[PDB]
Design a protein around this nucleic acid. Structure first.
Lengths: 125, 125
DNA sequence: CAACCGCAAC
DNA sequence: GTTGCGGTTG
């Protein structure tokens, strides 16, 4: 089945989630072999495409993201702060509904982000 | 007719997916001994894309090859999936399997495989 | 021992 | 493009 029977508990209890529930070092992992300038372009192009790939650096947990509920400023926010993009991406991770929220420096291509329990989605599951 | 193909499966960290068993230790860039497969429990439309990403606390994002596949009859069979990035002495990668439904469903497989330059080798002297 | 680097042989 | 195995090293 898509989710486990008690999402919130899994999310608040398992180390897997706990390690990702506070903001931490994330980083764009796309086109790792190309020159940095390109990676910058590739990154943004795809972001405007509502998608991207990022890893939680410390643990090495990788994720492909979809920024939809063309993207909205709510999911792909370019204004809010310059030099960096703020992203939001809902998904079902290991059976629990969550939302991935973080930001990325459009120049260094790294940043901070974390996992957030998505209770609304959960209840609909 | 006959009926018989998923092979040797194990649970992933998601309650909605199983995946093939991988060798404990394998050579980097070397074709795997079986074809990696992702089996979906809950209904998943044919054509849904499925991808594999890997990382761990040493290589935050391992380089892979042929890491995209498509669901057909609840099974996404990868043709020649390969691990190019190394995982580090005594270490193994954590896989991230992403099934692209809306929203995407993600399943991790921890300590799934160690990738080294040589791969398994008989002791030697 | 279990990595890495190299590369000869196919 | 694939593989097996010697030289080394921490």
């Amino acid at each position: 089945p898509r989710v486990v029977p008690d999402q919130r508990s899994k999310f608040e209890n398992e180390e897997f989630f706990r390690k990702l529930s506070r903001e931490c070092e994330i980083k764009y992992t796309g086109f790792r072999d190309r020159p940095h300038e390109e990676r910058q372009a590739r990154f943004q192009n795809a972001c405007r495409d509502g998608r991207s790939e990022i890893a939680f650096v410390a643990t090495g947990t990788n994720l492909s993201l979809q920024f939809f509920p063309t993207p909205s400023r709510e999911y792909v926010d370019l204004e809010r702060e310059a030099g960096k993009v703020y992203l939001k991406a809902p998904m079902i991770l290991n059976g629990v509904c969550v939302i991935w929220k973080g930001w990325i420096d459009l120049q260094r291509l790294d940043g901070m982000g974390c996992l957030e329990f998505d209770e609304e989605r959960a209840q609909q599951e | 007719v006959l009926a018989d193909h998923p092979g040797e499966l194990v649970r992933t960290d998601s309650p909605n997916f199983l995946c093939s068993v991988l060798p404990t230790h394998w050579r980097c860039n070397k074709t795997l001994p079986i074809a990696f497969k992702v089996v979906a429990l809950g209904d998943v439309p044919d054509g849904t894309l499925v991808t594999v990403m890997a990382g761990n606390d040493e290589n935050y994002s391992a380089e892979l090859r042929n890491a995209t596949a498509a669901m057909k009859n609840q099974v996404a069979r990868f043709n020649d999936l390969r691990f190019v990035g190394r995982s580090g002495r005594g270490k193994s990668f954590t896989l991230t399997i992403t099934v692209f439904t809306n929203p995407p469903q993600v399943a991790t497989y921890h300590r799934a495989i160690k990738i080294t330059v040589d791969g398994p080798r008989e002791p030697r002297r």
